[PDB]
Amino acid sequence: SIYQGGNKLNEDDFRSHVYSLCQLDNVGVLLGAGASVGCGGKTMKDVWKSFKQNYPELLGALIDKYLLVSQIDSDNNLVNVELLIDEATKFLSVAKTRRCEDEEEEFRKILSSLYKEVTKAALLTGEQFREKNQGKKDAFKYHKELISKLISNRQPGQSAPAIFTTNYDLALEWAAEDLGIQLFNGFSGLHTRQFYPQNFDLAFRNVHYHAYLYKLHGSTWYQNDSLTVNEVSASQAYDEYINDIINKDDFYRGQHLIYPGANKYSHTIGFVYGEMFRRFGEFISKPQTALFINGFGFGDYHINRIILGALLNPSFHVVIYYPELKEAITKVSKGGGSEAEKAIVTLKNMAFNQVTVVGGGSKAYFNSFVEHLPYPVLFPRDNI
Amino acid sequence: SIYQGGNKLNEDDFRSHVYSLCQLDNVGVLLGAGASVGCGGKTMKDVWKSFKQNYPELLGALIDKYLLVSQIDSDNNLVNVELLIDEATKFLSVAKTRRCEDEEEEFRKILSSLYKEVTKAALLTGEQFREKNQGKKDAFKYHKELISKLISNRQPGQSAPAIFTTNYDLALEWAAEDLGIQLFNGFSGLHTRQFYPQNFDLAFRNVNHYHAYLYKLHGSLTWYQNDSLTVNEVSASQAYDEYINDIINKDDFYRGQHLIYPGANKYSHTIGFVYGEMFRRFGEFISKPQTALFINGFGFGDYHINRIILGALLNPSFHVVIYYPELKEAITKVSKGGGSEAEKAIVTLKNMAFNQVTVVGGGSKAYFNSFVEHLPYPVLFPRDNIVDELVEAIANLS
Amino acid sequence: SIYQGGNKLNEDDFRSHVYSLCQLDNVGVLLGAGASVGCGGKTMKDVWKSFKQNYPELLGALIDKYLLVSQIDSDNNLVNVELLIDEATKFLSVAKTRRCEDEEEEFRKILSSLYKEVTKAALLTGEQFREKNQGKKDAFKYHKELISKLISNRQPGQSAPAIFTTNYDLALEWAAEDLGIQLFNGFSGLHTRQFYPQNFDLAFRNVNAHYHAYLYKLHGSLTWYQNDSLTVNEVSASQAYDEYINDIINKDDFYRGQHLIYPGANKYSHTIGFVYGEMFRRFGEFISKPQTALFINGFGFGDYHINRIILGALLNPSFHVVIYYPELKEAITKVSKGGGSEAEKAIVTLKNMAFNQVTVVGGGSKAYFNSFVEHLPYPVLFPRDN
Amino acid sequence: SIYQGGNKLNEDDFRSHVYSLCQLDNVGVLLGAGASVGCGGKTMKDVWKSFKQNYPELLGALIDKYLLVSQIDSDNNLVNVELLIDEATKFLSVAKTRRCEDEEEEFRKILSSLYKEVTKAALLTGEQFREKNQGKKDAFKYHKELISKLISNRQPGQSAPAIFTTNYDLALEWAAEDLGIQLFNGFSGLHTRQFYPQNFDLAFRNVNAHYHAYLYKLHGSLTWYQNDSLTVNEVSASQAYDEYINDIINKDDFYRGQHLIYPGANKYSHTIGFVYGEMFRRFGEFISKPQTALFINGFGFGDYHINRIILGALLNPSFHVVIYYPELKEAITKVSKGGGSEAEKAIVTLKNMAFNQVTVVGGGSKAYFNSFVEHLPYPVLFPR
Ligand SMILES: NC(=O)c1ccc[n+]([C@@H]2O[C@@H](COP(=O)([O-])OP(=O)(O)OC[C@H]3O[C@@H](n4cnc5c(N)ncnc54)[C@H](O)[C@H]3O)[C@H](O)[C@H]2O)c1
Ligand SMILES: NC(=O)c1ccc[n+]([C@@H]2O[C@@H](COP(=O)([O-])OP(=O)(O)OC[C@H]3O[C@@H](n4cnc5c(N)ncnc54)[C@H](O)[C@H]3O)[C@H](O)[C@H]2O)c1
Ligand SMILES: NC(=O)c1ccc[n+]([C@@H]2O[C@@H](COP(=O)([O-])OP(=O)(O)OC[C@H]3O[C@@H](n4cnc5c(N)ncnc54)[C@H](O)[C@H]3O)[C@H](O)[C@H]2O)c1
Ligand SMILES: NC(=O)c1ccc[n+]([C@@H]2O[C@@H](COP(=O)([O-])OP(=O)(O)OC[C@H]3O[C@@H](n4cnc5c(N)ncnc54)[C@H](O)[C@H]3O)[C@H](O)[C@H]2O)c1
């Protein structure tokens, strides 16, 4: 179920590709919601579902007094939320310009509920989230495996693999804490954690099991209107700030920075995206590379662009896994497609056999991703 | 006229500093409004005056209906266009959402007026702007030689320099064409030019090469869109022929998402992308080691730049030379409790006890004309014009 | 059906030959004008047919009043307009020295209408020509691929492949745009885009290790027109459709150096300019060199310059030529008794030549341009032991 | 004497400049009919006088009926011989197509007169043309010595000199062949000797360190001919004198059709277009390479295209041109009266140009073969 250069590839060639690939100089992984679904995570679609099923007042006000969606479109489960927050800032700044002190109520209620659904669907474990004994659960059956498999396909004098994802929650950090592996996601210390580029370039020397981490959703990173961000336990941050977001139902000020909103200029100085995409750009600009994606929602405009440039590195055999790939092709054939859907279907249909895309379906899940990677052989020896 | 922390600067120190800079990763120069008078463009003051003198009847909406502006800011011209135009677009979008007709029409006409006034001086040529081979006029002569000095100091194999501009003029294209150099600016192609930001990470090689990275900061006349939000660029002729003239002198004729300037459509990710990416490349450029940054003759009318510089002081390789014609007057004004944001910002910046702070109070000497006049030229340097004579002689043959 | 050096060869051996050639030092293709015929183009014979059908009564009157070309000659489709245009300039210069004013109009009609027809057939699109989003057309599905196989079959320390052709159109920058490929065309700048041979010494590379490709267009181009400024400029083509195409088509003015395209027998008519002087020079620098192979689409071979040099260039073993020629049995039977045209004799010249260095292919559908495109096997990736 | 940049120069500086100019990667010499005036040659004015005297009547038909030239224009001797010949042939083709026998014969007579005038005076050997070993004549001895000066000054391992001629006679080649020197002008063979362009991209090598060079012919030759093959079949002069040239030159009236190739006759067909267009072409390729100098001697700049090429080369900022005019003083005197043609206007304007890149060496006798030979030095090792 692998397509490259407009032609199919066989299982033996797939295995040879994998075996050759594991030993390349550099390897990296990015993934969307191909795994968080099993763990119980919530995506933007679930945010829309909850907003539909819990808020009739604001949704009805939008439907008629603003006319920002139709019933059929909402039923189709395709409405956007990040652009909705952008237009919410538009409306509310217009109100603060002309000072309409009634609309402010509804729009700030919408923002409160929205950012609530954003920063309150990242737990996956209820109020147990702040407790201890987290990584040990077996619900990470395959997750943990991945990290292990990617710290054995190595030889002395090689850099650690780089990892990317779209996870709001901290599932993979939980697996790391379980396995005792030395991850890295920007900060150092316990009492004080401050952003520093230099902290992203730390490597260990045995006198090893480790790996890297980089979240697109980013922020345990709290800013109490102090122009700075710091990190401490989920339990402390819970006892301190988000407790007030439990039984108050008040307005949401942008104290601590999390960025699901598309219009970056809504927060013109957002400074967590830059590092993640600097890392991604560095990862593109190298031969002997590999990127995997599996049911990665092609919904970001800035993620469908660097990849088209990335195709111009041949040994960058960019990989795709998408069980529901029929929708994009069907839309392209008749009536055109969306923006990122068109971008990815254009990525695939580049004459190179380097571009590799998987649309197998039931076999494209995270289970295939974990199982396909084999374990290393220390001494191949002479096989003749 | 030049002071370095109360000290005196001589020719030897300047020559040593220039020589040290010439062997650095990046070398560049910057010019402000004072030195950009000759380019032929117009500032925000001209646009605001023309708007308030050509559509006085619409001053009510900015205050009497939406509070977009005050009177003191308008009285002393303390309004930055980008904010007002952005608010106009916000009101237009909300009017579209709310099916409001009168406000829609008012904002459409206001946008038309501001566009008509702003677009005037961006051509740099006028009626003959559509004509190809625009470099025939001598106005661009000064643009050519200087560019050479920005790259002539680079030895073979050295990293190419960069050029930064404040306004949205397009003199660099014609200057490079006259000199015969190409610049990578996202756009690329012949028929369907599109914006490749990966284009930055490229280089040339010799089988058996100097260039520069071109950045368009505050918009552009040649910028546009094609019915798909995809960013395209085209030579000046088609832009001045098809759509620009209609906008200028077609009365009531405006549309939706077709033009990208100045910082206009940020509520749409597609446009914003361009400015965000250019700023990202700038910000990660200063993160380089052994890099030289220049802030020359700048009024510091922006807020993000100053805060970014303050937060980026961790780099021990920051050197700044700024021209400021009138300093005693501004010091007196701020001391009494007056002054604008720019004056306060520059005064605070200059109050750092460092030996890298240089202040120039030569007045008109800060202008481009005076700077050119003061400089000498080599005897053997080619300054005379011979292409015109050769072309005339060739045409004379029959 | 398939021959190499006067003997018969099988398809598998030809495929092995192609695979072995692909790894040599130099690669490049000479897409015959007929390659663009499928892209909406037309041949010189089609131009003759159009010029006959648009002026039927006038053509008949000219034929029966001066008999430059007999009606039977056109009926059999054995007319060479390439000679006709040189004939026309000859006649009209003779008259202009004779000053006959009445005769100074029919030849104007013939020449200007021929130029209009050539340019119109070279547009390839028509009214939609100026509309953008070209590359999305499915027709280029092969042409597109043709330019992606010349960057994957190369490694560090190798030259930049170049593309020869005999086409009016610009259908190489179209794929370039559609795939972001830099097919260096020898031009610099955009606002005033002028050709410069010095641009034939630039190649792309990856700083942290990029792709590139060259361009060699023999048959001029529509965009290449000069106003007696002895210069050629490259501005867009949609920009053109309103500029001069309709204008000249709907102005009815005397002909001049309207745009630099060459229908006519005299190739050195360009005795004043340089274009003609910078599209063979490197051709000769190419075909004669160690580890070289000039690809061709095989039909006709009806020139006095390129083929003349091509045959004589074979004196060194490294050069190889692979061509297709289905017309083997019929042509052999016709030429066995009697003689043939210059082109037919030139092409059958190599039948007597037994050099394995030359190749010929046939078999009808097996000898199409699609076979040429598919005969560019993918570069070795993840090699293993079989 | 010598004027560079509008100022005179001394002998020492000129000698130093000439000595330093010998660092060229490739060396070539350009010649023509200008240098043959002082050795007893004939000019175009003599040719026109001979034509008018032999067959004056013809001058009428072309001059008045066909308007091939004005009466005063003809009297001024401003008709290009090859162009008039070619357009007479074009008239003949017109007559063949449209069957106007009167003009056909009236033009056959004119063409026969033209070839009787040019071919008869071009053999330059009389009855010795049919003889062999024509290189033993002492009349060319001086010329032979000049060749030594061009080859004796080149160190071993350097490129041998090249010879360019603007006329279309083999007298210089006959003189040079007496020394057993080999020249590559794209010809080879004995019994069917032909014209081959690949010779321009091939050369010999020495394994015991002898003489080689390239010759270029532009305006035709005394031999170049044809026989129903569209080729260039060069053979020994005696074959030609015994085959068809005998029947043409001295006979009362005789002319054949598509048989002759000179002095640029049938440019209305491809046959010669490839020849000339591939012999002057390489001359341009000589100036393509950077840092190469060209010398002009015995050439009157009789073609506007040559001035066009010179000016186009001058457009680049790294090109230098040296101009030799045998009759500069006469040209200045003639144009001082307000007359002169387009070529005279162009050359006078170029001379008046005040640039340091213009060098003029013209004093009448100083531009002749004898003065040119005397000015040049002799080899130091040559016995004296
Ligand atoms: N922190 C930053 O600076 C930054 C910068 C850019 C983008 N982002 C975030 O990065 C972008 C990531 O895109 P996302 O929101 O779609 O990621 P997500 O994991 O939160 O959501 C899953 C996405 O994948 C699609 N999908 C559906 N089924 C799937 C499956 N079985 N497997 C995988 N995907 C499936 C969904 O349509 C889509 O929601 C978000 O738009 C945005 O929240 C963050
Ligand atoms: N990619 C980017 O760099 C980027 C990012 C965000 C916005 N923008 C653009 O920025 C938005 C608006 O920016 P702007 O026009 O307000 O900035 P600006 O052009 O006004 O900043 C420079 C100005 O300062 C003035 N000035 C006053 N005193 C001066 C002095 N003493 N010396 C020099 N100059 C002096 C000058 O007239 C003028 O050059 C546009 O909407 C948008 O196009 C660009
Ligand atoms: N300035 C320069 O660079 C320069 C120099 C020399 C010549 N030229 C020009 O170059 C010469 C090009 O010759 P031409 O264009 O007349 O050749 P052509 O188009 O007449 O011949 C090509 C051949 O391809 C055959 N064919 C039929 N079907 C085909 C198919 N499917 N694929 C491929 N071929 C098929 C056709 O029978 C035959 O026309 C012109 O004579 C001349 O105008 C230009
Ligand atoms: N170089 C090319 O590529 C090319 C191509 C086509 C035609 N041609 C023409 O082909 C040749 C045939 O024409 P041609 O019959 O006149 O032969 P040619 O070489 O003798 O032409 C030069 C003419 O200049 C005249 N002249 C006047 N003043 C002179 C002076 N001071 N010194 C020397 N000559 C002086 C000569 O009488 C005469 O020789 C011409 O030389 C040349 O114009 C050249």
C-beta separation of B262 from B218 below 8 A: yes
Q: What is the DSSP letter of C171?
A: T
What distances in angstroms separate CA C180 from CA A309, A310, C35, C63, D321, one per listed residue? 9, 12, 22, 51, 43
- Tell me how far apart the alpha carbons of residues C314 and C356 are, in angstroms, rounded to a whole number: 11
Q: Is C330 exposed, middle or buried (0-12, 13-18, 19+ CB in 10 A)?
A: exposed
Token pair listed for D95: 């007559």
- Tell me how far apart the alpha carbons of residues D329 and B338 are, in angstroms, rounded to a whole number: 81
- Tell me how far apart the alpha carbons of residues D162 and D217 are, in angstroms, rounded to a whole number: 12
**Contacts of C24 by beta carbon, 8 Å cutoff, 6+ apart:** C291, C292, C293
- Tell me how far apart the alpha carbons of residues C255 and C50 are, in angstroms, rounded to a whole number: 19
C-beta separation of D275 from D221 below 8 A: no
- Tell me how far apart the alpha carbons of residues A337 and A343 are, in angstroms, rounded to a whole number: 9
**Contacts of A23 by beta carbon, 8 Å cutoff, 6+ apart:** A153, A155
Token pair listed for C369: 């341009």
**Contacts of D286 by beta carbon, 8 Å cutoff, 6+ apart:** D26, D28, D292, D294
Closest CA–CA distance from residue C83 to any residue of chain B (Å): 30
User: Which among A16, A20, A351 has the least Cβ separation from residue C148?
Assistant: A351
Cis peptide before D263 (omega within 30 of 0): yes
User: Which among B192, B201, B226 has the least Cβ separation from residue C207?
Assistant: B201
- Tell me how far apart the alpha carbons of residues A110 and A54 are, in angstroms, rounded to a whole number: 12
- Give the SS3 label for residue D236: coil
What distances in angstroms separate CA B299 from CA B115, B331, B341, one per listed residue? 25, 15, 10
**DSSP-derived pairing of the beta strands A230-231 and B223-225:** unpaired
- Tell me how far apart the alpha carbons of residues B298 and B342 are, in angstroms, rounded to a whole number: 10
Resolution of the PDB structure in angstroms: 3.6
Q: Which residue of B has its CA nearest to D342?
A: B398
Map chain B to HEC letters.
Answer: CEEECCECCCHHHHHHHHHHHHCCCCCCCCCCCHHHHHHCCCCHHHHHHHHHHHCHHHHHHHHHHCCCCCCHHHHHCCCCHHHHHHHHHHHHHHHHHHCCHHHHHHHHHHHHHHHHHHHHHHCCCHHHHHCCCHHHCHHHHHHHHHHHHHHCCCCCCCCCCEECCCCCCCHHHHHHHHHCCCEEECEECCCCCEECCHHHCCEEECCCCCCEEECCCCCCCCEEECCCCCEEECCHHHHHHCCHHHHHHCCCCCCCCCCCCCCCCCCCHHHHHHHHHHHHHHHHHHCCCCCCCCCCCCCCCCCHHHHHHHHCCCCCCCCCCEECCCCHHHHHHHHCCCCCHHHHHHHHHHCCCCCCCCEECCHHHHCHHHHHHHCCCCCCCCCCCCHHHHHHHHHHCC
**Contacts of B82 by beta carbon, 8 Å cutoff, 6+ apart:** B262, B263
- Tell me how far apart the alpha carbons of residues A233 and A191 are, in angstroms, rounded to a whole number: 10
User: Which among B191, B203, B236 has the least Cβ separation from residue C191?
Assistant: B236
Q: Which atom of ligand 2 is nearest to the CA of B82?
A: 41
Angle between helices C342-352 and C329-336 (to 10 degrees): 100
**DSSP-derived pairing of the beta strands D28-31 and D162-165:** parallel
**Contacts of A36 by beta carbon, 8 Å cutoff, 6+ apart:** A43, A124, A167, A169, A171
C-beta separation of B179 from B148 below 8 A: yes
- Tell me how far apart the alpha carbons of residues D21 and A315 are, in angstroms, rounded to a whole number: 53
**DSSP-derived pairing of the beta strands D28-31 and B2-3:** unpaired
C-beta separation of C205 from B205 below 8 A: yes
Q: Which atom of ligand 4 is nearest to the CA of D43?
A: 37
User: Which among A13, A312, A351 has the least Cβ separation from residue C210?
Assistant: A312
C-beta separation of A127 from A4 below 8 A: no
C-beta separation of B137 from B260 below 8 A: no
C-beta separation of A256 from A283 below 8 A: no
DSSP string across D28-71: EEEE-SGGGTTTT---HHHHHHHHHHH-HHHHHIIIIIS-SS-H
Instruction: With CB atoms and an 8 Å threshold, state whether C208 touches A286.
Output: yes
Q: What per-residue string of b and e applies to A340-365 under the rule 16 or more CB within 10 Å gives b?
A: bbbbbbebbbbbbbbbbbbbeeeebb
Nearest to residue D69, comparing CAs of D38, D95, D48? D48
| Cα end-to-end distance, chain B, whole Å | 58
User: Hey, which bits of C113-263 come out as E strands?
Assistant: 162-165, 183-184, 187-188, 194-195, 203-205, 213-214
Any atom of ligand 3 within 6 Å of the Cβ of C59: no
C-beta separation of D307 from D301 below 8 A: yes
Task: Name the amino acid, one letter, at A65.
Answer: K
C-beta separation of A292 from B298 below 8 A: no
- How many contacts (CB atoms, under 8 Å) link B and C? 87
- Tell me how far apart the alpha carbons of residues A122 and C76 are, in angstroms, rounded to a whole number: 81
The ligand 1 site (C-beta within 6 Å) comprises A 32-34, 37, 43-45, 166, 216-218, 259-260, 272-273, 276, 294-297, 299-300
Closest CA–CA distance from residue B94 to any residue of chain A (Å): 7
Task: Name the amino acid, one letter, at A56.
Answer: P
Token pair listed for D24: 């060229």
- Tell me how far apart the alpha carbons of residues B312 and B306 are, in angstroms, rounded to a whole number: 10
Nearest to residue C123, comparing CAs of C249, C272, C294? C249
Q: What is the DSSP letter of A31?
A: -
Any atom of ligand 3 within 6 Å of the Cβ of C323: no
Closest CA–CA distance from residue C192 to any residue of chain A (Å): 28
Closest-CA residue, ligand 4 atom 43, reads: D303
**DSSP-derived pairing of the beta strands C28-31 and C293-296:** parallel
- Tell me how far apart the alpha carbons of residues B98 and B95 are, in angstroms, rounded to a whole number: 5
Closest CA–CA distance from residue C334 to any residue of chain B (Å): 48
- Give the SS3 label for residue C213: strand
Q: Look at the block and give the residue holding tokens 């009919």.
A: D33
- Tell me how far apart the alpha carbons of residues B64 and B57 are, in angstroms, rounded to a whole number: 11
Token pair listed for C199: 């641009």
- Tell me how far apart the alpha carbons of residues B95 and D303 are, in angstroms, rounded to a whole number: 74
Strand partners, B43: none
| Cα end-to-end distance, chain C, whole Å | 31
Any atom of ligand 4 within 6 Å of the Cβ of D103: no
Q: What per-residue string of b and e applies to B53-87 under the rule 16 or more CB within 10 Å gives b?
A: eebeeeeebbeeebebbeeeeeeeeebebeebbbb
Token pair listed for B290: 């052994």
Cα angle A40, A43, A45; round to 5: 120
Q: What is the DSSP letter of D23?
A: G
C-beta separation of B201 from B184 below 8 A: no
What distances in angstroms separate CA C208 from CA A283, A288, B205, B249, C111, one per listed residue? 11, 12, 14, 51, 56
What is the Å distance from ligand 4's center to C269 Cα? Answer: 19
Q: Look at the block and give the residue holding tokens 């000039």.
A: C294
- Give the SS3 label for residue A266: helix
- Tell me how far apart the alpha carbons of residues D32 and D280 are, in angstroms, rounded to a whole number: 14
- Tell me how far apart the alpha carbons of residues D43 and C238 are, in angstroms, rounded to a whole number: 56
Strand partners, C233: C194
Instruction: With CB atoms and an 8 Å threshold, state whether A269 touches B304.
Output: yes
Nearest to residue A258, comparing CAs of A245, A242, A277, A271? A271
Q: How many helices (H) and strands (E) does chain A have?
A: 15, 8
- Tell me how far apart the alpha carbons of residues D155 and D158 are, in angstroms, rounded to a whole number: 6
- Give the SS3 label for residue C214: strand
| Cα end-to-end distance, chain A, whole Å | 33
- Cα A326–chain centre separation: 23
Nearest to residue A142, comparing CAs of A122, A171, A165? A171
User: Hey, which bits of C256-326 come out as E strands?
Assistant: 293-296, 320-322
- How many contacts (CB atoms, under 8 Å) link A and B? 67
CA dihedral A360, A363, A364, A368 (to 10 degrees): -140
Please report all neighbours of B, defined by 3+ CB atom pairs within 8 A: A, C, D
Token pair listed for D127: 């009855």
Any atom of ligand 3 within 6 Å of the Cβ of C186: no
Left (φ > 0), alpha (ψ -120 to 50) or beta: where does D157 sit? left
- Tell me how far apart the alpha carbons of residues B170 and B154 are, in angstroms, rounded to a whole number: 24
Nearest to residue B368, comparing CAs of B150, B142, B183? B142
Token pair listed for C297: 């689409």
What distances in angstroms separate CA D363 from CA D36, D321, D328, D350, one per listed residue? 16, 19, 7, 18
- Tell me how far apart the alpha carbons of residues D321 and D294 are, in angstroms, rounded to a whole number: 7
User: Hey, which bits of chain A come out as E strands?
Assistant: 2-4, 7-8, 28-29, 162-163, 221-222, 230-231, 319-321, 356-358
Q: Which residues of C touch B202 (CB under 8 A)?
A: 204, 207, 210
Strand partners, C3: C8, C360
Nearest to residue A346, comparing CAs of A317, A307, A314, A315? A307
**Contacts of A10 by beta carbon, 8 Å cutoff, 6+ apart:** none
- Cα D304–chain centre separation: 15
Instruction: With CB atoms and an 8 Å threshold, state whether D349 touches B396.
Output: yes
Q: Give the residue, out of A36, A37, A43, A47, with the most ligand 1 atoms within 8 A of its beta carbon, to mutate for a pocket test.
A: A43
Instruction: With CB atoms and an 8 Å threshold, state whether A309 touches B198.
Output: yes
- Cα A355–chain centre separation: 22
Q: What is the DSSP letter of A161?
A: P
Instruction: State the maximum Cα–Cα separation within chain C, in Å, rounded to a whole number.
Output: 80
Q: What is the DSSP letter of C202?
A: -
| Cα end-to-end distance, chain D, whole Å | 29
C-beta separation of C234 from C194 below 8 A: yes
**Secondary element (H or E) of residue D187:** strand D187-188
Helix then strand then coil, % of chain D, to nearest 5: 50, 10, 45
Token pair listed for C255: 């002909």
Nearest to residue C120, comparing CAs of C168, C56, C87, C167? C168
What is the Å distance from ligand 3's center to C171 Cα? Answer: 15
Q: Look at the block and give the residue holding tokens 């040189």.
A: C86
C-beta separation of C293 from C159 below 8 A: no
Choose from B191, B206, B227, B229 for mutation: most chain C CBs within 10 A.
B191
**Contacts of A226 by beta carbon, 8 Å cutoff, 6+ apart:** none
Closest-CA residue, ligand 1 atom 12, reads: A166
Token pair listed for C320: 């190889």
What is the Å distance from ligand 1's center to A78 Cα? Answer: 14
C-beta separation of B191 from C177 below 8 A: yes
Q: Which residue of A has its CA nearest to B68?
A: A97
- Tell me how far apart the alpha carbons of residues D287 and D285 are, in angstroms, rounded to a whole number: 5
**Secondary element (H or E) of residue A47:** helix A44-54
Closest CA–CA distance from residue D270 to any residue of chain B (Å): 28
Q: Give the residue, out of A31, A37, A44, A324, with the most ligand 1 atoms within 8 A of its beta carbon, to mutate for a pocket test.
A: A44
- Across the beta sheet with C7-9, the strand order is C7-9, C2-4, C358-360, C320-322, C293-296, C28-31, C162-165
Task: Name the amino acid, one letter, at C38.
Answer: G
- Give the SS3 label for residue A28: strand
- Tell me how far apart the alpha carbons of residues C187 and D115 are, in angstroms, rounded to a whole number: 48
What distances in angstroms separate CA D365 from CA C351, D35, D147, D301, one per listed residue? 60, 10, 21, 18
- Tell me how far apart the alpha carbons of residues B104 and B91 are, in angstroms, rounded to a whole number: 8
Any atom of ligand 4 within 6 Å of the Cβ of D44: yes
**Contacts of D34 by beta carbon, 8 Å cutoff, 6+ apart:** D297, D298, D299, D300, D326, D367
What is the Å distance from ligand 2's center to B283 Cα? Answer: 17
Structure determination method: cryo-EM
Nearest to residue D32, comparing CAs of D169, D200, D221? D169
**Contacts of D341 by beta carbon, 8 Å cutoff, 6+ apart:** D78
**Secondary element (H or E) of residue C72:** helix C71-75
Rg (CA), chain A: 22
CA dihedral D341, D345, D348, D349 (to 10 degrees): -170
- State the sign of the Cα–Cα–Cα–Cα dihedral C54, C56, C57, C63: positive
C-beta separation of C152 from C379 below 8 A: yes
Cα angle C178, C184, C188; round to 5: 110
Q: What per-residue string of b and e applies to A238-252 under the rule 16 or more CB within 10 Å gives b?
A: beeeeeeeeeeeeeb
Chains B and A lie in contact, requiring 3 or more CB pairs less than 8 Å apart: yes
- State the sign of the Cα–Cα–Cα–Cα dihedral C21, C22, C26, C27: positive
Q: What is the DSSP letter of A69?
A: -
Closest-CA residue, ligand 1 atom 23, reads: A297
C-beta separation of A347 from A308 below 8 A: yes
- Give the SS3 label for residue D163: strand
